[PDB]
Amino acid sequence: STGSATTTPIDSLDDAYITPVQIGTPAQTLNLDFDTGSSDLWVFSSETTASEVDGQTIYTPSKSTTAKLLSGATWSISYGDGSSSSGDVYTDTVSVGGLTVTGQAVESAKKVSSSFTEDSTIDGLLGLAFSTLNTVSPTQQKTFFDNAKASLDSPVFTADLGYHAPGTYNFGFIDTTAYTGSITYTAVSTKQGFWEWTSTGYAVGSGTFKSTSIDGIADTGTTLLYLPATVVSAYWAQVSGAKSSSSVGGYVFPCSATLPSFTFGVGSARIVIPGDYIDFGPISTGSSSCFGGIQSSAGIGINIFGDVALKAAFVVFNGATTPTLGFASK
Numbered sequence: 001s002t003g004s005a006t007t008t009p010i011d012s013l014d015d016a017y018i019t020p021v022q023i024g025t026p027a028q029t030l031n032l033d034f035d036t037g038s039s040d041l042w043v044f045s046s047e048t049t050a051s052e053v054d055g056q057t058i059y060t061p062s063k064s065t066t067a068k069l070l071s072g073a074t075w076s077i078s079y080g081d082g083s084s085s086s087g088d089v090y091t092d093t094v095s096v097g098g099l100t101v102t103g104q105a106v107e108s109a110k111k112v113s114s115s116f117t118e119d120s121t122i123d124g125l126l127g128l129a130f131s132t133l134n135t136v137s138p139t140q141q142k143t144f145f146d147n148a149k150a151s152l153d154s155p156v157f158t159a160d161l162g163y164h165a166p167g168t169y170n171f172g173f174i175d176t177t178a179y180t181g182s183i184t185y186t187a188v189s190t191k192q193g194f195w196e197w198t199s200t201g202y203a204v205g206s207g208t209f210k211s212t213s214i215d216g217i218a219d220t221g222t223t224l225l226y227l228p229a230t231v232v233s234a235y236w237a238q239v240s241g242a243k244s245s246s247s248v249g250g251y252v253f254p255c256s257a258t259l260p261s262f263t264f265g266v267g268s269a270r271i272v273i274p275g276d277y278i279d280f281g282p283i284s285t286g287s288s289s290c291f292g293g294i295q296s297s298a299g300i301g302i303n304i305f306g307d308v309a310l311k312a313a314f315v316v317f318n319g320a321t322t323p324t325l326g327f328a329s330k
Contacts (some may be wrong), residue, residue, distance in 0.1 A: 221303060
């Protein structure tokens with residue numbers, strides 16, 4: 001089997017991407033944030049504290065003839081950005097782009113933090129990291145990909161995120177028309193439960209490539225590119241007027257600037273992030289100070305190849321017995 005679903009930016013800045021997911025019988029379609037940095041499929045639901053729902057579409061398990069309460073199971077998750085959610089668990093039928101999993105753990109939110117409430121466009125998350133990170137207790141549950149894997153034509157999924165435009169998540173096949181040149185594959189460590197890999201270095205604009213190992217995670221659920229302070233300083237040094245602002249919470253730059261590209265290495269291959277991808281717009285409405293898309297990972301504890309990086313590539317998440325990651329230009 002295979003599946004193919006379009007993923008759409010939630011706003012004009014590509015702050016996140018939503019992908020429609022069918023849950024239950026008859027189908028209830030929710031727009032979920034596909035997140036290769038976590039491993040829980042959770043949704044706003046009829047059980048979510050009413051004051052914490054503000055415009056989201058909810059899953060109502062009582063209206064699904066295939067929903068079953070997973071007795072005694074609870075979940076609770078905290079994300080790197082400080083947000084959180086928790087609740088109980090159903091199993092139900094879940095389909096993404098024509099690919100169907102029966103008995104998928106669907107984690108129903110009883111509580112969500114303010115940032116989720118305040119984002120009306122995201123109805124929940126669909127985790128695509130390794131199932132070892134799943135938070136369901138006392139019986140850990142499998143991700144949608146893990147459940148689908150054996151049935152897929154090939155045990156892979158691909159992320160093809162757009163810049164200011166829709167893109168695609170495919171399951172079970174590699175669309176050879178979706179990228180240019182070749183896909184370069186690179187080793188993955190699953191030891192922290194992430195799609196963790198080591199970039200071979202970077203360049204700023206038309207500058208020379210610096211060969212240096214940068215361990216980080218391919219994370220579709222993180223907006224920006226978080227890299228070591230040395231790398232980030234080197235980038236922003238090429239933008240007149242750019243500075244790190246403690247009050248804003250990162251590097252900012254004059255909105256009048258033309259940003260240089262940023263290149264990262266994948267083995268001997270190179271992925272180029274155009275400068276415009278690194279512009280996240282005014283820090284507040286009407287400001288001429290703009291927020292940077294490349295930020296320091298110092299104090300996160302891990303480097304994160306988030307959407308800013310991933311959207312410059314066609315990315316293969318290869319879930320073979322020994323997982324690997326593939327990157328191609330597009």
